[PDB]
A = this chain, B = another copy of it.
Amino acid sequence: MLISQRPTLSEDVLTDNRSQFVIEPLEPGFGYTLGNSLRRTLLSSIPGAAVTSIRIDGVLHEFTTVPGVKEDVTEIILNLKSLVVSSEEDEPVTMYLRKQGPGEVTAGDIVPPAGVTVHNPGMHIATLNDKGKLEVELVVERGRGYVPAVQNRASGAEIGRIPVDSIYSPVLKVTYKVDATRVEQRTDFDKLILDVETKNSISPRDALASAGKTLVELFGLARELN
């Protein structure tokens, strides 16, 4: 006996980030391999955007301090490394951040050009007092994966530029769970539930499409053997 139904994909939305996708019916033994292939694709190769280097006014290198600011520069870098940004152009883009006087500088003071948006407008960056002022220039690009700091001398940049590390992946957490029907009379099938949660930069529906595109294009080189 051979089953005639074909598997279908269905979506259930829990929040703006978490979603569940149900795939059924599957063969008795599918469900873990398919889910794990989707999970390996999602967590590794999805394009995104990130900052690559910064420049501050009166700072030459990373291991120094700025007057009036409660944190040194390396702590500023460690705070900025959690910024959520989304670019569209195929070229590096430059954003500016200026603040004067007492208060607290957060991500809401960054003015992005046309085509760049900041999705995390309330993250703490630094805190300033009556005689502190902050001027920062940021550069954003697009890519995939993880790229460590590109050394300054390898691009001919000035002496005030601070290269920084960048993480491009917008997917935060992925899991799966299989439900198996093992009734008698040899009518068995599996159903897969795949749960995805992104980083507010991309919709959980638009990551699975990229994963499917990559996987089908990669698996298509076996089919051409005919």
Give me the interface of A with B, judged by CB distance under 8 Å. 1-2, 7-9, 11, 23, 27-30, 32-34, 36-38, 40-41, 43-45, 47, 141-145, 147-148, 150-151, 153, 184-186, 205-206, 208-209, 211-213, 215-216, 218-226
Chain B residues within an 8 Å CB radius of A33: 36-37, 40-41, 215
CA distance A14 to B218 in the complex (A): 25
Out of B7, B40, B147, B220, name the residue touching A221 (CB < 8 Å).
B7
Given A213-B223, A222-B9, A40 and B30 touching (CB < 8 A)?
Answer: yes
Smallest Cβ-Cβ distance to A208: which chain B residue = B222
Indicate if the CB atoms of B150 and A185 lie closer than 8 Å: yes
Number of copies: 2
Which of A2, A36, A185, A218 has the most B CB atoms < 10 Å from its CB? A218
Q: How far is the CA of A185 from the CA of B149 in the complex (A)?
A: 9
Does A9 lie within 8 Å of B212, measured CB to CB?
no
> A1 to B143, Cβ gap below 8 A?
yes
A-B contact pairs, 8 of them (CB 8 A): A1-B143, A2-B144, A27-B44, A27-B145, A38-B222, A206-B225, A208-B222, A219-B219
Tell me, in angstroms, the Cα distance from A218 to B185 when the chains sit together. 24
Measured in the bound complex, the distance between the Cα atoms of B153 and A206 in whole Å is: 47
A209–B185 touching, CB < 8 Å: no
Q: In this complex, what residue of B is CB-closest to A225?
A: B209
> Which residues does chain B contribute within 8 Å of A27, judged by CB atoms?
44-45, 144-145
CA A99 to CA B226, docked complex, whole Å: 41
Instruction: Flag if B220 contacts A212 (CB, 8 Å).
Output: yes
In the complex, chain B residues whose CB is within 8 Å of the CB of A29: 40, 43-44, 145
Nearest neighbor of A144 in chain B, beta-carbon distance: B2
Structural contact, A218 and B7, CB atoms closer than 8 A: yes
| Bound: A185/B150 CA distance, A | 6
Structural contact, B211 and A23, CB atoms closer than 8 A: no
Instruction: Looking at the assembled complex, report how far the CB atom of A41 sits from the nearest CB atom of chain B, in whole angstroms.
Output: 7
- Which single residue of chain B is at the shortest CB-CB distance from A26? B218
